[model samples]
Target chain A: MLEQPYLDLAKKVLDEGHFKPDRTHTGTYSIFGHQMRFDLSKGFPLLTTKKVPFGLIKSELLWFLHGDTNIRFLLQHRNHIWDEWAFEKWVKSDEYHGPDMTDFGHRSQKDPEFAAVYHEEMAKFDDRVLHDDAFAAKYGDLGLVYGSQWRAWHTSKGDTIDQLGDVIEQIKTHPYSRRLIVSAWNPEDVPTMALPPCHTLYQFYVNDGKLSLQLYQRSADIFLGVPFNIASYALLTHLVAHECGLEVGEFIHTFGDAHLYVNHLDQIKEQLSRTPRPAPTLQLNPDKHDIFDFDMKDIKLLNYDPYPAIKA
Target chain B: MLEQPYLDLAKKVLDEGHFKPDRTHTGTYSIFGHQMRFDLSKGFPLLTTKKVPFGLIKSELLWFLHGDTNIRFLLQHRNHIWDEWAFEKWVKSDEYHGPDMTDFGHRSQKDPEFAAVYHEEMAKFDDRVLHDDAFAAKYGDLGLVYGSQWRAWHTSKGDTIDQLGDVIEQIKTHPYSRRLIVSAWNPEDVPTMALPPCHTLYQFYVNDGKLSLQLYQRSADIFLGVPFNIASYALLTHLVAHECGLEVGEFIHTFGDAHLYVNHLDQIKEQLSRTPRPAPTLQLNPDKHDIFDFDMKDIKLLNYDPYPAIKA
Candidate 1:
């Protein structure tokens, strides 16, 4: 029953959520506010109903922890989750002369010919980003992504604030303080950002030798995004707790506008039909006291059994 | 039935909440994540179990909407909720020759002699802030409070963003947007702040001709603060919906560290023992289209019958 909350949310949305149009042009069955809690003392919250890519989550989180805004780091780990944003920047830049890649995101999904072309162009872009330092520095960096917001928040006085580092220090020194928070939704950057932070802001609470975290995600695609978000924050909580020498408490995922895309209804329904299994356990290197020093090999998942991944 | 969620939260926290020491040095019975929903179509959510001052809520909200961060506006409306923050600034300044008010917040509560002096000095401070324009400009202003963050968020480029104004416009033109959000937690300001924002961020969602709002509060004093927070935001949702020409849907309040101070246990229990009454209805000026232009007289609460206020 570790993942029943996820299934319950899917069922609730399917039953009574309002049908609303979204910016994606694909409509959704949406609810306004919802909260889900996963107690890490029981088990890790990776969904057993469908296979979630834990490795990609690990690499992406480490990238954020490192304060590395460039997609070069993610590409080095063979993770392509963030390549599309970087590719979009490259194609829209003056340096790009290979092909016309306008409206490539939705276009590639519809037309097979365009899909082939987009893949080839993306492969070329990835290759160049990996090999050419100049190209990587020019086009691969996402200036104001989570890494920047969390690690190097720009201040008006021409300096930066390390919110994550400050919060970790507070957890160690002032564990009972209620102000342990890190925010990613900068009002200054939201207007120009291609995609603002879905996981907008998060807070940490320490009580009874355990650390708990709550994330306020402004927008959630329940089927495709919620599972990974749950596991990701859960892992972050575990990591921070490990560094602070405390036990893990809970990862609470709170949403503003949680929805299921019309295209993913069948996929969600298929997932809901399957019963949830035991949630896997997470393992972190005992010697890893600083979360910023963690690497891929330092984190591991154990006893993760799940159904096959369902594509929407 | 409409206000049952609030009572349920109080009962839940009292039952299984953890006892944790906080920054206030007043330990609390705490829970990390909790949410409560109130449907505005049914009635306004001012607690019927205990009387809440609707006039103070109205005047304070109007002041914030006007983007006025000074306590003078609140004092003009005979509201004292924000006087202490201003008074603290005045008494701590170099110009003050009054008796040392060090640790006045806690000390005054215990020593009656100090309480009298503190109140006398506070009255003098408040009088000067109201009557003296120069003094008011210097001390009465609580810069970067809710008003400043909501109406004029400072940018690194030497310009300010009107977050609330932009959100209202988005509600009118692109009602389906999930990014209609206003955040009060600026990382640039939190470190130096005496008390950072408790109602950290809020998002607006419109669907089926109804507008709903969700607030992510980083910390909550469930006994003393939660009631006021519920009504303040519900009234906000009503006013915004009125301005945007939409019907009110729901107000979802989510919390990070919801807690009850040890001193307020009896007060909350007394409230719980009282029977619930019929909910009140809020009536806004139909002709007022702009929220910023509305005054305190334009908003009214009707049929708000409740038990007497319980003092903590």
Candidate 2:
């Protein structure tokens, strides 16, 4: 089963993982060095045990593919997954005028009144990002997120290199090259960034006319993050293969520190108890081969009959 | 046994791998996304099926720990693993008055007469690097290798960042933090580099007063490289854990394109036929705790009884 690996991973952490406090101040049952593979030939790896938001994943991936770091594109697509990160930047900036948004992340989670206020502020922020160009240009652009690193990696000479485009060209011309890799973990940028890249690096392998990818994620909030990560990389593999005129292969997700936050334990437990239904199949527009040109309407999820969404 | 994982990895690739030609023009039977674990507490991960030189591993690691990019340090220790890279640069420069070593690497392997000439040239180069101060300073430096990448990662702003030192500090202050990672895949350097980093990035985890390390190697020459890699990282974990006052835990090795070169099949087969003996233990100087301060004399391998060395 495509979903069995996730169940096994969640179960393994629950059974005998080491307990430790984390960046979120939420304790975790964590383990290091875990790997899971999804055979794209079988189906897209959207979790059938719990409903995963395929729309957000699609929008997020499209945004990354376009090298668009500004949140305006994401907000325009109705994706709010990255709202907090941009909001964090906006709130900390000198121009921000809002009700005290300090420690709003944890405070919103703890206090219902604060949550209501945060929701209103976030909605206003998103609205401004969509409508106002100057505000979006200033605060919406995350300088070193995956999109920036993937597309325009800043060099010592102050030149920009498109790693994603280069790798794609390599996949087409020199498929057997072992150095086909895209890395987002820049040491120079880590200290200044709010969050260093979690999906640190990924490598592509081509064999038997099939394209495969292996992602090295440094940290994983397994329950909430892993599902999206798996599907995101799987879609990426599919898109890259589509461009290169190759068959789809396995998506191998390798982790460094995989953890389940204590707060999400019940949600994960409920997810583990449910049996996974038929895996979802992704439908990509055959007319549009270049992934860079993909729009929200171009990608669709088919027969994704998942259990109800489990909120942590 | 602790070594079973490695054995299984070698066997699996041989059985079900896809054939492809690599950048070296050597054919390979390869598989992607494989992982192996070694509990450092049990013993050092030196292969018992075939003898591996611990001296080279120790000197190379120490070189990286010191952030020494010059091959002069390695040559002084009689470790010639990096000599070819440096020699390649020296021979290409106009300062060299030597034989045409244009296709030296592959040509030497194919022609014995060329091999002897190449060997003589290499010995002369090594001696020059060893004794000549100006010459060594000019050409002996293989910049942006593991040493520079691990210790002093060069930044866009022209300032250098000590990633390894910072990571060690992070381990002490934030033991449970998920971001304890040291990366070698700098996008700015990859295109211009002769050989990009193979052991791309690594992460550290601590729990229950024990520290474990995970290496994400983008490519693996399973027969020749994996053994050295396993021992190198295991030793690194031990040194770091010792410095941080934590007991040793597991060393997890994950790979991207793990392959056995066509030329090395017979040797790997011979290796598989042999049974693994008890693993060896590493002995580091008790008095010298700082990894950077230690020399060759401070490190030793104990009870490394193994079968004869395999040429492949």
Candidate 3:
């Protein structure tokens, strides 16, 4: 499962470390492209060499399962990867005046209180990260955790307008105890973060029967986290190895920079030329487990093939 | 780019704050599975609804461009998305008593000299946050930050080692300088962190001309970090958008709980039945930039079409 031998030694260590320059007499690191790795055990890892349709990995994994930063709710769906960084900072931020301002970029048509305080703070932070029901029953634990709420955010700044009801009372009441963990770092919440954490902390291990996950990523942009950090921790190690009962096993992806972005060299050499295929099947909805009782019609998929997509 | 109307409002906020209790009145919040979303603007986001093999996103962006995390060199480059998390923990972990610790259970090889003495104490605690000569003279311009040295490490439990050259000389004379940011949430470090930093901090905004990236992924497993957190910050906004010059803006991400495990409910409903398309063009090479000297031979990619692939 080291998936095709660590993607053929990360493609022979990025084709001999690309233009080889670990410090070429201080030329300054040199490179402009990127990296990527997809292998979900021969299936359901999606990137098919070429011939895209459009669901952008299921609407960017449902806009980060809804912790969304904002962009009018990601332009309603049909994504474009954070749309030019949320429309170039929503036209120079300060929530830029409102409707009409000469095409809304600055407001002109009788701005009614920044569009009702900007759609009520974008529908209250998209209803607490995409629809809060006591905040998905308390922080909605899927792999439940985010570094103890960005390095400890139980609640303080502005002292809770509804700090997601204590993140849903810390998800029903924390599991395995030790407070389940849920951070976001917080150097003061990192400058009011719109983007600060990077796949941060992940621990959830279970011993024996099997069920592990380590994920320590401090930063990995390797053309977007070596294949979505190996399918988001092997799909959360197959969803906590089948909701605790256990099975899935390891997922260890510990890194920091993990490069590969020199303009994604021909999308990693036309996907290293293409020929791998097999991993597919991630059906979901198994009598739902919580973390917000499944939706988008309960998600589904069955078969899949590959070889045809690579354009960094 | 806020792709797909922000995943249709994260599926109407996980179909109205996803839920599903019962077992003794939902007892302690449960922690099973639910939330999920992915929309890396449409393409090259990998995980195209499953079948993961865009050459493991070009060998995981060439294993983060040779930062070398040892899966035995990505299992000599077969890159099976880290073969079930590094040979399921070196054949079974217990400190694997060698010979790949023979078959299914009881593994533990303990000491390749402690993985080369914790990779030479992760490069002499890389001047704090992998600032080893500034992550070897600008880890692709500080995009390789390893949590100020995995949970702010200084070593000593093993006794001796503490260089952190002042955050590697402030990331080699300041790269983009948001202060660079790298942490694991040290309350005096996590405990020697061989694995304690989960993608904690990352910020490199610039603006206008372009170079955006906003990760802050406190905790997201939506099929493993929305395709490696949108291809690891769109490959670090295409490598600090060409290491500080600019032209690859938009990558945002954010997230917090972002769940959906329970064995990835049929691979998140088989990547929502697939059908996305459009985003594809991570080209780069534009006269390389340091970021740890981009590799995999500088990268390249043009056309990318997606569809067909499932089996999460």
Model 1 C-alpha lDDT versus the unseen true structure? 0.91
lDDT of 3 at B24: 27
lDDT of 2 by residue, B71-103 (tens): 999988989999988998989998888789997
Candidates 2 and 3: which is better by TM-score?
2
Candidates in order, TM-scores: namely 0.98, 0.98, 0.28
Clashing pairs in 2: none
Worst 10 residues of 3 chain A by lDDT: A24-33
* Tens digits of lDDT, candidate 3, B1-312: 324533433344344433333222231111221222333333445433344344455555455544444333333444545433344333343533443234222222344445554344333323332233333332212221242342233332332211222332333455433334544443223333333344444444332354444444444545554565556546655654465555654554543334444444554554564555655555667778765556655665455555655444
lDDT of every model, 2 decimals: 0.91, 0.90, 0.43
lDDT of 1 by residue, A152-185 (tens): 9999889999999999999999998889999999
Q: List, in the given order, the native-contact fraction of each candidate.
A: 0.93, 0.95, 0.02
How much DockQ does model 2 earn? 0.91
Better of 1 and 2 by lDDT: 1
Task: Encode model 1's per-residue lDDT on B185-272: one tens digit a residue.
Answer: 9999999986799999999998889989999998898887889999999999999999999999999999898888888888888788
Give the DockQ ranking, best first: 2, 1, 3
Model 1 CAPRI rating: high
Task: Give candidate 1 regions above 4 Å deviation.
Answer: none
Instruction: Give the Cα error of residue A195 in candidate 3, in Å.
Output: 25
